[PDB]
Write a structure and sequence with these properties.
The structure is cut from a larger assembly and holds chains A (327 residues), B (32 residues), C (84 residues), D (295 residues), E (59 residues) and F (426 residues). Chain A contains 16 helices and 2 strands. With 327 residues, chain A is mainly α. Chain B contains 1 helix and no strands. The chains are: A mainly alpha (327), B mainly alpha (32), C mainly alpha (84), D mainly alpha (295), E mainly alpha (59), F mainly alpha (426). The structure holds cardiolipin (CDL) (2 copies), 1,2-diacyl-SN-glycero-3-phosphocholine (2 copies), Ubiquinone-8 (UQ8), 1,2-dioleoyl-sn-glycero-3-phosphoethanolamine (PEE) (2 copies), heme C and protoporphyrin IX containing FE (2 copies). Chain D: One of its GO terms (biological process) is mitochondrial electron transport, ubiquinol to cytochrome c.
């Protein structure tokens, strides 16, 4: 049997309903980045429509019980959100796909530090429950803001998609487990998956996808299309950013301090074509240097190296010192 | 997106409510 | 006395009921391999229980070992009584 | 989770709204030596209960499951019990399982090894002789509302009169503790009915109390074995409480001792590469992943 | 909390940009014997002899 | 059978001995030990139950008399019967607490599958064994249980034929039915031990005390360090249960669900239908039957509960696709403007408040369903208890729907925050 040309395909999947199958250039499975999909979906859900209005009304509760809750729990243990959002506990513990990716690409430190940070706390927690991390550890935990953590999260997810998840092709499958149990034995994978039935060929064009307009809109200002070239727009943006900073204590600034809007405006102007002398030369130089350093990839200097061991056999496994003229 | 998978999801959500409707009707009938 | 331990221990400096260091501490072993460098800035230890958790009886260790064996024997004896 | 008392169901247990169930257990506290803390059966009480059951009861009721020699170590001795039970007779028709052991072809005096059978050969004979209603078998009777109190209440609760709308048929009597409050048993206990061997005054409450104690003595989970099992539970609970500290020492303090570790991370900047991390590692379930996942 | 992800392009196990503390900061050991933490009952020499006897006769 | 790739661990005696003498256990707490308590109790059931095998003659007309006479003449027989009866209850308690603990930890991931299914199957078998045991009591409760089981079995065949006769001969407890059910009960009870051993071997692959991954590499040795702690925790839980039972179950009680067990089949032909109630562990199933008067729908509800409990890893957990699976949606498609949704990732446990709320609602609903008997004399005639209905609906929804256990908003809001923070800090 051919799944295409089946009765349902012949009747419903027809040009009249625009349900016809269109064959185009061959393309990879998983053609849509998950991170981009989540960004666009988040923009559509929060910054558009009645759903956006509702999710904006509930923002205080979400910040209180999701962001601040997680942050407080992490700080109690001397950890940051990076310790949970960058690599899920499951991925660090047992997941084999993450293990292979880390072994092939990642440096040992990237995961070693993640594990040791939890080891610190848990060595004491198992011995005595209710451990509260002292202030000296808590300070260094709070030093890192959320901007760098989200930078790392986006980098890691994009890398994983582009390298590995972009080089996969799932197939119809039976129970991977070798259990003799009939319940597990007859598990059938391949049906009830939307991807399996939407496209029967790797040539078929992708019918559903975010429009370029939606992507461009999602790439816009997260705080709702404020005019940074006007006084009223700047005031609205400043109040929005201030309330955001208050809501998220350790996202972009420490709770005590306040956000510096002049530097942000200088950054945005330098990024775009707009420029002028209204910005102090010192501010412009500092902004440019910080922008250069932020994206700079750290590199090893090849200095302060320790001696490489060159072991030799012990004395008792070597011939004795004395040696004369044999013959 | 597939028609039958979407229908399967709808019936999964709805069938519990259908059973609740049947239970309520049975209670009304038993009341007399 | 029997209850003097609780009274004496009440005077302790501990963070929220946990005996932890008041500042970062780093320990190095002078007998480490040559290829090891200086200690990494990472604070591996939050607590110094290795030194704190000590009864300074390096001499007379076998007596403490016998005490531990006796406690284990009491526990096993109770369990074996139930099994009997 | 919260239940209602005015409904008539104890603790939310429905099905007993047509009789009194909380008389002496929940809304009242009738003292029974057996169920008291560190309590035990009163030998005199069970003796009197057997005396009553052998002179008024038994002629209608019986315990097919039980036998007289249950009373050997608490209430009666062997010779005394044999003398008491020799006054009854069992036909071979009584035997639930006659087997080849019982080789009698006529009546004979009972022995302490005989099961407690009523004078009737079967349930139907008892129904015929008792107006079509069968005197319930007291064996396993513990499973009635109020437990041991049940026998005591019905034996005593005959003084009340029916309300309007309830009709008591001829041959039936009103007893609020029975199912639907209509019972075919005429009031049996009357003062002076039984002359005790120990001289105890014979009044219907005392006779009911003795009979209830005896009837409870014959049960399996409750009765002659319950008090010793309660003492055993107390002893085992004491043992567990006393073993808890040693469990603590052996498990939790021990784990805390094992966790007293020192860690030290150094800077190893020798030319050696970390090949083992890059090319290494094994997974037990690799056979379950090979050819199935991530490809 | 440390910083950006570093991939296997860094050959050395310890990248140069990490910080190594000087020898001044590392705490020094107390290479002296300290008083034994022992209770009154076990400090009794008779109890110590009993422990030794149990060790070397039954244990 | 080329489709079968083998077995995880060979159960040879020497290999088992070596595996258990070398096994190590990470530091844990009491909550993560219920599984052991589930096994040890079974290890007693095989013993105590065996002692009951030598006592019970499968003839229905002699089981009560034989039990009563063996209580007196024989010693420890009633003690072992009590031990067996209470072991069933303790085993149910331990198994359900273990199930709740493993549900709370989100153990549906692919690396958990072998651990999960291998466990659930055992649980399923356990249920069957329990059923058989009840029938051996030859009380009116056993009669009702057998009748209900036979009716459910016959519902499959639409009432045509007598396909139930080979085991439920006449749908009544007679010599044939009792003998067959007793022997099957013994056989399956002993098979439960092997199933539990297989599950225990499989689960060690990814056994953890808590969801959060402690970076501890050292571990205890199972034989004495972990075994002693497990035995002590079992002792502690037994003490707690005894303390609870002392207050909750005074021996002289006005009413109890056990009174319905008074009637013995054959001796008493009259069944008190007004007061019908099973043991608490099978209470929720009869409550569901009374709540849903429809036979087919009730049978489907029971089957769905058990099987969906079995297939949790497939429905909810991650698979070959690293969270790139396309879940179907009903309403959020309009809001997001997408027909499907990528499966959310940040489904943590300890720091996730939504997961805790949903899980504790589910657990409370289960407890409420097990709380009481609907009393179907007029339960439906009167407006039925809405709490039982709502709890059953939520039990069904929680087991089968990924939005309760893997909500989308958890990651959507986090991504919103990430985008805002990165935009502010570039
Ligand atoms: C229309 C009718 C409908 C009827 C419905 C009701 C009845 C249904 C069941 C019928 C019988 C089939 C049972 C299949 C297994 C259980 C069910 C299941 O899905 O498996 C769960 C479970 C899933 O395992 P898993 O999770 O994949 O774990 C890895 C595997 O176990 C990998 O395992 P392994 O490769 O390591 O092999 C293990 C094997 C090691 O093998 C050997 O060393 C020798 C094997 C050959 C033995 C040759 C002698 C045969 C006679 C003695 C048999 C003794 C063992 C028990 C065999 C099972 C049946 C009694 O055994 C052991 O290591 C020791 C076993 C423990 C001892 C005690 C067992 C008592 C069993 C009593 C209950 C039986 C099941 C009833 C289920 C009812 C429904 C819930 O499977 C088992 O537990 C397998 C047990 C061993 C089976 C051996 C081969 C059996 C061959 C059967 C052929 C067909 C017979 C048809 C007639 C039957 C008449 C009664
Ligand atoms: C006084 C107190 C009384 C309390 C009573 C108890 C019951 C009430 C609720 C109790 C508390 C909640 C318990 C359950 C939820 C626990 C939390 C949880 O899991 O939340 C996470 C979960 C997150 O879902 P997700 O991860 O976004 O879902 C992923 C996908 O979307 C996948 O999901 P999806 O998109 O497919 O949709 C998921 C969900 C819907 O959830 C969503 O909305 C999804 C999105 C949630 C995120 C946030 C969205 C925010 C914007 C939504 C706006 C919606 C419009 C409402 C606008 C309100 C403001 C104007 O839909 C369902 O699963 C059920 C749909 C069933 C359809 C039935 C159609 C049957 C038709 C055929 C019938 C045939 C038989 C009859 C025939 C008759 C013929 C005559 O959210 C929910 O469960 C939503 C509920 C939130 C908490 C409850 C809020 C209150 C709602 C009820 C108010 C009642 C007031 C009564 C007043 C009475 C005065 C007298
Ligand atoms: C459990 C009872 C087992 C009874 C076994 C009796 C044998 C029955 C078959 C007789 C011969 C007739 C064969 C007809 C053709 C079949 C072809 C086919 O489908 O091939 C299958 C294929 C054939 O094997 P193959 O694929 O290796 O074949 C290779 C090709 N040959 C054979 C030529 C070398 O294998 C299977 O898929 C086997 C499926 C077995 C399923 C068993 C399910 C039993 C369920 C019991 C109850 C479970 C209860 C669980 C607990 C519940 C608790 C509440
Ligand atoms: C100021 C005052 C301070 C003092 C406060 C003291 C408070 C102490 C609180 C202690 C804990 C209390 C326990 C709360 C929970 C009680 C639950 C309950 O009612 O249990 C009664 C029973 C007690 O037995 P019982 O037989 O007495 O039942 C209650 C009896 N009546 C009805 C008369 C009230 O609890 C148990 O024994 C059960 C324990 C294990 C339960 C495990 C979960 C099973 C869930 C199965 C779900 C199946 C679903 C599938 C069905 C198919 C279709 C979907
Ligand atoms: C991997 O993760 C896992 C765990 O960790 C969490 C588990 O805990 C578990 C749970 C583990 C279990 C249930 C196993 C624990 C089992 C328990 C408690 C019950 C069984 C315990 C035993 C010790 C069985 C012993 C069996 C026997 C036959 C030996 C009997 C015992 C004793 C002391 C007697 C030994 C001596 C003799 C037999 C000989 C006596 C006679 C003579 C010397 C005389 C001989 C001479 C003549 C002439 C006769 C599993 C399965 C798991 O997978
Ligand atoms: C012993 C046997 C007893 C009798 C068993 C009878 C089984 C009857 C099964 C009836 C199934 C009815 C639904 C079938 C729908 C098929 C539809 C189909 O193939 O059309 C394609 C269409 C997709 O196209 P679109 O995405 O809409 O187009 C995109 C355009 N851009 O497919 C779907 O959507 C279907 C998705 C769900 C499929 C579900 C299949 C379930 C099969 C279960 C197993 C059946 C086994 C039967 C034999 C059992 C023997 C023991
Ligand atoms: C509350 C329910 C439980 C909770 C469910 C929650 C999740 C729901 C998810 C979606 C499930 C969708 C299921 C849709 C169909 C469900 C059908 C069902 O359950 O049965 C109901 C419905 C009607 O039931 P009634 O009792 O009449 O109810 C009153 C009606 N006024 O039942 C049916 O009609 C089902 C009929 C199925 C017949 C199939 C054919 C059987 C033929 C004989 C087979 C013999 C096989 C023999 C094999 C031998 C091998 C050797
Ligand atoms: C024949 C005159 C009897 C004598 C002597 C005793 N009882 Fe009886 N009893 C008898 C009958 C016919 C019935 C059945 C009544 C009915 O409506 O079914 C009973 C019943 C009881 C009961 C209740 C049984 C039940 O299942 O609830 C009890 C508790 C009871 N009888 C006790 C009892 C006692 C203590 C007696 C000696 C004092 C006694 N009965 C004598 C007939 C006869
Ligand atoms: C008779 C029934 C059962 C027995 C005897 C049993 C036994 C055990 C034992 C001894 C353990 C190891 C100790 C521990 O629990 O920490 C364990 C772990 C486990 N069991 Fe069970 N169990 C049973 C039911 C179940 C059920 C119902 C499930 C799931 C629904 C399950 C899944 C698991 C899982 C997931 C683990 C831990 C694996 C992990 O953390 O990844 N088991 N079980
Ligand atoms: C996990 C294993 C087992 C479980 C869950 C189990 C369950 C049960 C249950 C629920 C009952 C009746 C409960 C009650 O009376 O209130 C029972 C009774 C009984 N069990 Fe088991 N059982 C198990 C193992 C065994 C084994 C292995 C045997 C025999 C080898 C056995 C023999 C019996 C007997 C004979 C009875 C009835 C005793 C009597 O009526 O006097 N059981 N069991």
């Amino acid at each position: 049997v051919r799944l295409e040309k089946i009765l349902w395909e012949q009747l419903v999947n027809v040009k009249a309903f625009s349900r016809q199958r269109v064959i185009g250039a061959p393309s990879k499975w998983y053609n849509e980045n998950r991170t981009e999909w989540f960004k666009v979906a988040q923009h559509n859900a929060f910054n558009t429509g009645f759903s956006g209005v509702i999710l904006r009304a509930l923002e205080p509760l979400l910040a209180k019980f999701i962001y601040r809750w997680r942050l407080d729990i992490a700080h109690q243990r001397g950890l940051t959100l990076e310790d949970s959002l960058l690599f899920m506990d499951r991925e660090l513990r047992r997941c084999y796909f993450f293990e292979t990716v880390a072994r092939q690409n990642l440096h040992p430190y990237t995961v070693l530090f993640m594990k040791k940070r939890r080891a610190r706390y848990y060595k004491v927690e198992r011995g005595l429950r209710g451990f509260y991390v002292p202030d000296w550890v808590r300070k260094e935990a709070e030093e890192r803001q959320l901007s760098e953590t989200v930078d790392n999260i986006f980098n890691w997810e994009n890398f994983v998609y582009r390298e590995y998840m972009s080089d996969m092709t799932p197939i119809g499958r039976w129970t991977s487990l070798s259990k003799i149990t009939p319940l597990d034995m007859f598990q059938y994978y391949g049906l009830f998956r939307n991807e399996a039935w939407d496209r029967f060929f790797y040539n078929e064009a992708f019918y559903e996808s975010y429009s370029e307009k939606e992507k461009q809109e999602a790439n816009g200002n997260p705080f709702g299309k404020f005019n940074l070239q006007t006084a009223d727009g700047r005031a609205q943006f400043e109040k929005e950013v201030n309330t955001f900073i208050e809501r998220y204590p350790f996202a972009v600034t420490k709770p005590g301090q306040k956000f510096d809007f002049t530097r942000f405006y200088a950054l945005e102007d330098l990024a775009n074509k707009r420029d002028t002398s209204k910005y102090d030369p010192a501010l412009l130089e500092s902004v440019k240097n910080e922008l250069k350093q932020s994206a700079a990839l750290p590199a090893d200097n090849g200095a302060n190296k320790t001696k490489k061991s060159k072991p030799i056999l012990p004395d008792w496994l070597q011939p004795k010192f004395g040696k004369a003229f044999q013959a | 997106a597939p028609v039958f998978l979407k229908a399967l999801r709808y019936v999964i959500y709805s069938y519990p409510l259908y059973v609740c409707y049947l239970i309520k009707q049975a209670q009304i009938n038993a009341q007399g | 006395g029997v209850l003097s331990e609780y009274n004496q221990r009440l005077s302790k400096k501990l963070h929220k009921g946990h005996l932890v260091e008041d500042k970062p501490t780093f320990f190095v072993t002078s007998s480490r391999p040559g290829n090891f460098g200086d200690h990494i800035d990472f604070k591996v230890n939050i607590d110094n229980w290795f030194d704190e958790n000590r009864v300074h009886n390096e001499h007379e260790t076998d007596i403490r070992r016998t005490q531990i064996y006796t406690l284990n024997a009491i526990y096993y004896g109770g369990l074996l009584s139930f099994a009997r | 989770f919260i239940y209602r008392d005015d409904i008539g169901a104890f603790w939310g247990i429905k099905g007993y709204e047509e009789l009194v169930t909380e008389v002496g257990t929940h809304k009242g506290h009738n003292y029974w030596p057996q169920f008291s803390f560190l309590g035990t059966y009163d030998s005199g009480s069970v003796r009197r209960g057997f005396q009553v059951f052998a002179r008024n009861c038994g002629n209608c009721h019986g315990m097919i499951y039980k036998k007289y020699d249950y009373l050997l170590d608490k209430a009666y001795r062997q010779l005394e019990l044999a003398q008491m039970v020799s006054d009854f007779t069992i036909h071979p028709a009584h035997q639930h399982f006659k087997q080849y052991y019982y080789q009698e072809w006529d009546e004979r005096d009972r022995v302490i090894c005989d099961h407690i059978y009523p004078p009737y050969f079967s349930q139907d004979q008892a129904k015929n002789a008792n107006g079509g209603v069968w005197p319930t078998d007291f064996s396993k009777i513990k499973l009635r509302p109020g437990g041991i109190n049940y026998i005591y209440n019905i034996s005593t609760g005959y003084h009340f009169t029916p309300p309007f709308g309830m009709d008591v048929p001829k041959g039936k009597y009103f007893n609020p503790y029975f199912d639907h409050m209509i019972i075919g048993m005429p009031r049996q206990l009357v003062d002076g009915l039984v002359d005790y061997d120990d001289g105890t005054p014979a009044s219907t409450p005392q006779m009911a109390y003795d009979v209830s104690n005896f009837i409870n003595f014959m049960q399996r989970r409750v009765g002659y074995k319950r008090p010793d099992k309660m003492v055993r539970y107390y002893m085992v609970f004491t043992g567990g409480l006393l073993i808890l500290p040693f469990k603590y020492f052996k498990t939790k303090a021990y784990y805390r001792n094992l966790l007293s570790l020192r860690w030290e991370m150094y800077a190893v900047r020798d030319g050696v590469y970390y090949n083992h991390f890059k090319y290494g590692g094994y997974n037990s379930r690799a056979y379950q992943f090979r050819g199935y996942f991530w490809a | 909390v440390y910083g950006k992800l570093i991939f296997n392009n860094i050959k050395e196990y310890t990248p140069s940009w990490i910080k190594t503390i000087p020898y001044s900061q590392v705490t020094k050991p107390i290479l002296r014997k300290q008083p034994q933490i022992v209770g009154k009952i076990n400090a009794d020499p008779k109890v110590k002899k009993f422990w030794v006897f149990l060790r070397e006769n039954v244990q | 059978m080329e489709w079968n790739k083998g077995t995880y661990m060979s159960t040879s005696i020497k290999k088992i001995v070596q595996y258990f003498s070398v096994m190590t256990v990470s530091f844990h707490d009491i909550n993560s030990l219920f599984g052991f308590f589930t096994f040890l109790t079974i290890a007693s059931q095989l013993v105590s139950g065996t002692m009951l095998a030598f006592s019970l003659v499968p003839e229905p007309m002699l089981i009560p008399m034989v039990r009563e006479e063996e209580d007196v003449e024989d010693l420890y027989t009633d003690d072992f019967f009590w031990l067996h009866e209470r072991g069933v209850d303790m085993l149910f308690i331990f198994s359900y607490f273990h199930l709740f603990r493993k549900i709370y930890l989100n153990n549906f991931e692919y690396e958990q599958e072998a651990a999960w299914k291998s466990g659930v199957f055992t649980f399923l078998l356990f249920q069957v064994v329990v059923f058989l045991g009840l029938v051996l009591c030859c009380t009116h409760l056993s009669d009702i249980t057998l009748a209900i089981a036979a009716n459910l079995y016959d519902t499959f065949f639409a009432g045509k034929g007598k396909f139930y006769w080979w085991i439920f001969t006449s749908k009544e407890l007679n010599t044939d039915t009792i003998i067959r059910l007793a022997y099957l009960h013994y056989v399956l009870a002993f098979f439960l031990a092997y199933l539990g051993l297989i599950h225990g071997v499989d689960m060690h692959y990814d056994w953890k005390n808590e969801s959060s991954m402690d970076g501890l590499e050292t571990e205890m040795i199972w034989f004495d360090e972990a075994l002693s702690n497990e035995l002590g925790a079992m002792i502690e839980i037994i003490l707690i249960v005894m303390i609870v039972c002392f207050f909750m179950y005074p021996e002289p009680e006005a009413l109890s669900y056990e009174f319905f067990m008074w009637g013995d089949i054959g001796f008493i032909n009259d069944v008190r239908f007004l007061s019908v109630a099973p043991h608490w562990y099978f209470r929720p199933f009869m409550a569901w039957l009374t709540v849903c008067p429809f036979h087919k729908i009730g049978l489907f509800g029971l089957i769905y509960y058990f099987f969906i409990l079995f297939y949790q890893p497939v429905i909810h957990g991650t698979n070959e696709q690293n969270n790139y699976t396309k879940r179907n949606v009903a309403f959020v498609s309009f809001f997001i403007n997408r027909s499907d949704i990528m499966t959310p990732k940040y489904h943590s446990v300890e720091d996730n408040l939504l997961h805790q709320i949903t899980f504790w609602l589910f657990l409370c609903s289960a407890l409420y369903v097990t709380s009481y008997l609907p009393y179907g004399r007029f339960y439906n005639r009167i407006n039925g208890n809405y709490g039982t209905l709502w709890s059953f609906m939520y039990i069904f929804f929680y087991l089968g729907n990924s939005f309760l256990r893997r909500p989308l908003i958890t990651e959507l809001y986090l991504f919103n925050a990430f985008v805002k923070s990165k935009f502010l800090k570039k």
